[PDB]
Design a binder for this molecule. Structure first.
Ligand SMILES: [Cl-]
Ligand code: NA
Length: 129
């Protein structure tokens, strides 16, 4: 599924991401735009053989099991496929654990490089929320 900007904003809010660990909803929508371009089926293979999955490009190195990342953890205790679903629940629950790990949204390199310190509330403005 390729979410609308406002559609994703609404889903992330109903799943409790607005101000989760102090990050306003715009931060989460900005992160999804540059991670996946709002495509739930996005994947990207890393040079280390791990894979990033779904709307927030969550990595098999630590967070989910795909059966093809030797020596990896699965700290979200989920199959990495679960993160490609048209329904964002598993991705939001996993992302809550990630952002609580110590480095907050810096865990998403694209958020640190492209969202952090910008007017992120621009990503939710005009949205019925
Ligand atoms: Cl933080
Ligand atoms: Na893994």
């Amino acid at each position: 599924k390729v979410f609308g900007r406002c559609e994703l904003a609404a889903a992330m809010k109903r799943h409790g991401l607005d101000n989760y660990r102090g990050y306003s909803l715009g931060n989460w929508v900005c992160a999804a735009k540059f991670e996946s371009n709002f495509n739930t089926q996005a994947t990207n293979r890393n040079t280390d053989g791990s894979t990033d999955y779904g709307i927030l490009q969550i990595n098999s190195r630590w967070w989910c099991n795909d059966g093809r990342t030797p020596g990896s953890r699965n700290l979200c205790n989920i199959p990495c496929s679960a993160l490609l679903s048209s329904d964002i629940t598993a991705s939001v629950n996993c992302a809550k654990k990630i952002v609580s790990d110590g480095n907050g949204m810096n865990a998403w390199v694209a958020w640190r490089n492209r969202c952090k310190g910008t007017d992120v509330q621009a990503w939710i403005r005009g949205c019925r929320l």
